[PDB]
Nucleic acid binder design. Structure first.
Length: 100
DNA sequence: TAGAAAGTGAAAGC
DNA sequence: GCTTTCACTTTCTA
């Protein structure tokens, strides 16, 4: 309910993170936007929200008290996601995963 | 074109 | 149940 997989599965379905969405509802496949922060269009508030929320959710980021750290948010999220043994990255700017 | 700023997996950490 | 660190590897933009 508050672990990465149920939390992510929930974030996906919310449809509030633009770009985060299902590609197959029944094999449990979804994509996460993965824009490079060094890119021209990139901006903290539209490309790092999902990563940021994961930090808020796990207490790693407290808004107002901490200085933003999207690099860390991105890397923390990617290592927590990769640590899950019941999620797979389909190595086919996005990343595509399957909930097993 | 280039180095700085991102980004990365994997082992070590709590 | 993931987070941090580490020793490198990438993506940029101009």
């Amino acid at each position: 309910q508050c672990r990465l997989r149920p939390w992510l599965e929930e974030q996906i379905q919310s449809g509030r993170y633009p770009g985060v969405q299902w590609l197959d509802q029944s094999a449990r496949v979804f994509q996460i936007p993965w824009k490079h922060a060094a890119r021209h269009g990139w901006n903290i508030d539209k490309d790092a929200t999902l990563f940021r929320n994961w930090a808020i959710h796990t207490g790693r980021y407290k808004p107002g008290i901490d200085k933003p750290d999207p690099k860390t948010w991105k890397a923390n999220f990617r290592c927590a996601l990769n640590s899950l043994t019941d999620v797979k990255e389909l190595q086919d700017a996005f990343r595509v995963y399957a909930l097993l």
